Design a protein around this ligand. Structure first.
Ligand code: MG
Lengths: 49, 224, 49, 222, 79, 313, 220
RNA sequence: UGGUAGGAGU
């Protein structure tokens, strides 16, 4: 929430000013960047469910 | 000057370029906070086109570490000087001796834990007489870049800002010399076609000593 | 030589003076060293940190 | 309890004075001495300089032509100028001088209510007789130390640090005093070091008045 | 201005689920319209919930039964 | 750009930079309690900005976010009163640049101070390995409610009494407090007020303050000593003891459970550590925290009064 | 510029009947320390009061001896009498006598009433009599003085404690006001023997200190 | 701006 989750960042900032102190975890953007970097070498990365 | 020192401080002070040392001795014809003029003695005075050498002191100028460099005349009017004596004191020198800091009364005792491990407790008298105040010179540069949609101009009128900001600026969009600026205050116009004006960074509050303008050969010159 | 120089002035040879507390006003025991020391101010300012 | 009375205001110099208190019970001497010293070094009315304007200069980091000393050094010299105003809490002092020679504080144009304790104080030196200097000195009444940063308009005005404090060194001793036959009577002498602006006896009276006023906080009137 | 947690830890020994239950109770106070049980004196919801947990009137089972009562009230208003 | 220290895995995935963080030089504050820490007013204002905005919107001084932002930038009078409410009970995480211990990062309850330096508790600095010589420490603000509860329950300095490496206590009087305690708890062969018989510790303090008796004079003081012979109950034991004035004065801050035998000795650093560990074993945590604060204050005060100095003689 | 901040009894908290803690509104920088130290010195050094100074017992004629049937040592008897707090109206020198026999603690109320003198705590225990047939006949003499007078400076001699105050501790910590960031808050502790309440002790000390400055404050 | 060194602090 303080580093990479841009949606988490804006939601946390909006929550704080409203008196709420919740938190949406989300996914860091650094991890997605790493996923794309590894996919760029012909290695298949997938967050399989 | 240090009350107790090794004794070579004079050598390291004169051997650096900070202090102005008289190359030819004589008498001090004219002294001033900006320059010193020495009347050379006849014996040391060359026969052909004999004259008097002029020492121009460098006043407050920014150093590499953003500290002030200034020369203080340590000689009076009419005081004789010889070859090799220091005429002006550079930064952190006193009468030709390397004066790095200040000497003050010191007591070695614990005091209510305020000097716990390496902390130091300083009397308010030290602050009151301004004996540890240091000058700091900063350099802020603005460039009139040639971006698309028309060149960027340095002009006074800044859209969508208060007149108070323009009050400090002159009619040419440059800050007056000697203005007590503070963090965020506009220093130049720097209006871009479409706003982005160079301003004092936050936490900085000091008078503007001088402004230097470099202009490309061929373009017009603003009134400032 | 330092002791002789101190005796040249009107100072104790041991180099320690009895100091009085500033606020309480009661003199400290164990005479405390007092003297003049050359102190420097380093470039590690605090408003820059 | 015997009441202390002030008996001697003996002065050994213009800036040095010793004030003695003859009658004092045992234990009261040190208490009164310490309280008086703290309340004298802490809070006393002063008349230090606050503002200065020089016609030629704009900012205090510049150098005036024909003046031996830098403008910052001139301001630092002015900071130590000791002056007392007996009628007003605000005054404007004008200094005008021309020709070769040191510019002492005696050259300041003076009014009836403004006097200089030590005219020998030097401000700056003029090296060229053609050059001339002019100042407008602004003097205010205050107490404590008020830095120039915490003031809360024109370019010409130069701000100096203000330290309104006439006293700079207070020392006291408690000695045995012989009154009639009873012993334990103590004599308290207080040695003062002012800049000449504030009288010693008046300083003691003001300090004791402040101490008595502050004592009324946790006690009913007495 | 609570300084210790040991007394509240004695109620819930793990001291790890203490954080969870206290966070749930404080979320109940500060997000919902729920008013604290223990009297409040210009304190943050953190310390208010911790002081309730200390007094023994708040527990995980107590919160669960309270939530069940609120669920029953909500379903009752439906019909 | 994947492998190595400069790669994503080490630099960005495990080393994310965090908002709501600040850095400043640290300095010692002896006024602080164990759980508190100094915090500059400007640093606190910058870190807690969204909370200030929310409080301004709730109170109603600022209608919109832009108005609140302008008001905060103006640092008006009302902003400080709002700030005092926000940081009233909000812990802040403090850590040193090298973080070796689990205790390298600890949570404190902040107090607004003037200046640009973070005031740190003297006893805490032992775990941080701080030296107060240009040392720097970064602060972090836990935002979410779970994070605040978590910091209060686990990371607060009052909770970290014993190091995880070994059972020995991690807070201990170190440099000046131990010197003051050693100076206070010592005996001189002949001193002012020797041979006196005193009613109790209060009389010893009154005698030392008035100057009638020295801090090292051997006297006989009646001491009320409590021993928990019964399970959960304390029985008072009063007797005359051959102790100095300094030991009697120090006995006032000692809790009820501890015996008098600990104070009677010379009280070196090992003795102080043993006394703190004994208090932790017997009376729990809260009395140990109060005792540590009292020990630090008393040691600092009496070390200052001692006027210990080093000289060439 | 002569105006100064004035506190008004921001908190006077009574821990017990004989123990109190006093707090003050923001004081100017450095006034907390001087006020606290002045009050401390006045209370410990110069406060009128009455206490036992010497005691004569027919049973024991030496400082170190033994009394039959008394579990308390002779030294402990002196401490118990010294801890006794008594106030006397008018007369500056009065002698108190007490005789008692039988098993049971010799409480303070056991002493003869002796008219004007009052004992603040009658439950104060002087000595214990182990034997029923054992008896104690002791005679104490009290007088009004000022401050603590040790026995060394001074037939059994017991050091007198004229001042009603047992413990004084003043603490100063920073206080915040909108206009002035650095100010002082004075916290004063109090431990009196019970003859005079802590608030009255502080009032009397302040009155004495302000009376000592009457001559200085002239035409003010 | 961003990547490199360069020196320094703990
Ligand atoms: Mg360090």
């Amino acid at each position: 929430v303080k580093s990479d989750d841009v949606n988490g960042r804006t939601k946390m900032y909006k929550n704080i000013v409203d008196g709420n102190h919740q938190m949406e975890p989300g996914m860091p953007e650094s991890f997605n960047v790493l996923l794309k970097e590894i996919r760029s070498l012909g290695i298949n990365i997938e967050l399989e469910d | 000057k240090p009350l107790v020192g090794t004794g070579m401080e004079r050598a390291v002070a004169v051997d650096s370029g900070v202090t102005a040392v008289a190359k030819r001795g004589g008498v001090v014809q004219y002294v001033d906070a900006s320059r010193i003029v020495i009347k050379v003695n006849e014996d040391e005075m060359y026969p052909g086109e004999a004259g008097i050498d002029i020492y121009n002191l460098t006043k407050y100028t920014r150093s590499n570490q953003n500290t002030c460099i200034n020369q203080m005349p340590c000689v009076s009017l009419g005081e004789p000087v010889e070859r090799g004596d220091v005429l002006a004191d550079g930064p952190s020198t006193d009468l030709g001796e390397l004066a790095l800091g200040q000497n003050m009364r010191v007591a070695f005792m614990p005091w209510n834990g305020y000097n716990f491990e390496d902390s130091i407790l300083v009397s308010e008298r030290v602050v009151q007489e301004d004996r540890f105040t240091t000058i700091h010179i900063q350099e802020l540069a603005c460039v009139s870049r040639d971006t698309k949609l028309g060149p960027e101009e340095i002009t006074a009128d800044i859209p969508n800002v208060g007149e108070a900001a323009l009050s400090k600026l002159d009619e040419s969009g440059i800050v007056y010399i000697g203005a007590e600026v503070t963090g965020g205050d506009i220093l130049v116009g720097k209006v871009t076609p479409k706003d982005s004006s160079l301003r004092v960074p936050n936490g900085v509050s000091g008078t503007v000593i001088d402004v230097q303008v470099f202009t490309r050969d061929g373009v017009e010159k603003d009134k400032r | 030589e330092i002791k002789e120089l101190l005796k040249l002035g009107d100072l104790p040879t041991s180099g320690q003076i009895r100091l009085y507390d500033g606020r309480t006003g009661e003199q400290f025991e164990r005479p405390v060293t007092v003297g003049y020391m050359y102190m420097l101010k380093l470039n590690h300012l605090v408003d820059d940190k | 309890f015997l009441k202390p009375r002030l008996v001697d205001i003996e002065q050994v110099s213009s800036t040095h004075a010793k004030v003695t208190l003859e009658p004092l019970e045992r234990g009261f001497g040190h208490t009164l001495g310490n309280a008086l010293r703290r309340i004298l070094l802490s809070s006393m009315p002063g008349c230090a300089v606050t503002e200065v304007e020089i016609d030629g200069v704009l900012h205090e980091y510049s150098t005036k032509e024909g003046v031996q000393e830098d403008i910052l050094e001139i301001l630092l010299n002015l900071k130590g100028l000791a002056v007392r105003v007996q009628g007003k809490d605000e005054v404007i002092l004008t200094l005008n001088k021309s020709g070769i020679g040191p510019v002492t504080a005696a050259d300041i144009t003076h009014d009836g209510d403004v006097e200089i304790v030590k005219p020998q104080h030097v401000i700056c030196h003029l090296t060229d007789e053609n050059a001339s200097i002019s100042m407008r000195i602004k003097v205010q009444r205050g107490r404590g130390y008020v830095p120039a940063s915490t003031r809360i308009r024109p370019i010409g005005r130069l701000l100096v640090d203000a330290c309104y404090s006439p006293v700079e060194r207070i020392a006291y001793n408690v000695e045995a005093a012989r009154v009639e036959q009873r012993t334990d009577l103590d004599k308290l002498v207080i040695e003062m070091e002012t800049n000449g602006t504030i009288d010693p006896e008046e300083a003691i009276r003001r300090a004791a008045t402040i101490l008595a006023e502050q004592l009324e906080a946790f006690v009913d009137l007495e | 201005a609570r300084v210790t947690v040991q007394d509240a830890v004695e109620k819930i020994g793990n001291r790890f689920d203490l954080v969870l239950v206290a966070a749930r109770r404080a979320r109940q106070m500060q997000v919902g319209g729920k008013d604290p049980l223990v009297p409040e004196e210009n304190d943050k919801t953190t310390v208010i919930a911790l002081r309730e947990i200390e007094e023994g009137l708040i527990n995980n089972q107590i919160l669960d039964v309270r939530e069940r009562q609120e669920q029953q009230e909500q379903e009752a208003a439906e019909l | 750009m994947i492998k190595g220290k400069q790669g994503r895995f080490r630099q960005n995935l495990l080393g994310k930079r965090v908002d709501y963080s600040g850095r400043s030089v640290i300095t010692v504050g002896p006024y602080l309690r164990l759980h508190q820490c100094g915090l500059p007013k400007k640093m606190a204002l910058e870190l807690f900005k969204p909370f200030i905005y929310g409080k301004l919107e709730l109170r109603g001084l600022a209608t919109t976010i832009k108005a609140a932002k302008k008001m905060v930038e103006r640092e008006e009078a009302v902003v400080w009163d709002i700030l005092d409410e926000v940081i009233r009970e909000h812990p802040v995480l403090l850590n040193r640049a090298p973080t070796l211990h689990r205790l390298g990062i600890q949570a404190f309850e902040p107090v607004l101070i003037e200046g640009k330096a973070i005031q740190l508790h003297p006893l805490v600095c032992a775990a941080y390995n701080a030296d107060f010589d240009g040392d720097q420490m970064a602060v972090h603000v836990p935002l979410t409610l779970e994070a605040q509860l978590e910091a209060r329950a686990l990371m607060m300095s009052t909770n970290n009494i014993l190091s995880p490496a070994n059972g020995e206590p991690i807070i201990v009087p170190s440099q000046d407090v131990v010197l003051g305690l050693y100076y206070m708890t010592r005996d001189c062969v002949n001193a002012k007020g020797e041979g006196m018989v005193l009613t109790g510790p209060k009389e010893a303090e009154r005698l030392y303050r008035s100057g009638l008796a020295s801090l090292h004079a051997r006297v006989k003081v009646r001491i009320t000593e409590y021993e928990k012979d019964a399970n959960g109950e304390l029985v008072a034991k009063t007797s005359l003891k051959d102790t100095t004035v300094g030991r009697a004065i120090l006995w006032m801050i000692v809790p009820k459970g501890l015996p008098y035998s600990i104070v009677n000795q010379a009280l070196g650093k090992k003795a102080i550590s043993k006394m703190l560990n004994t208090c932790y074993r017997i009376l729990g945590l809260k009395p140990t925290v109060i005792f540590a604060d009292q020990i630090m204050y008393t040691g600092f005060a009496y070390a200052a009064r001692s006027g210990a100095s080093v000289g060439i003689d």
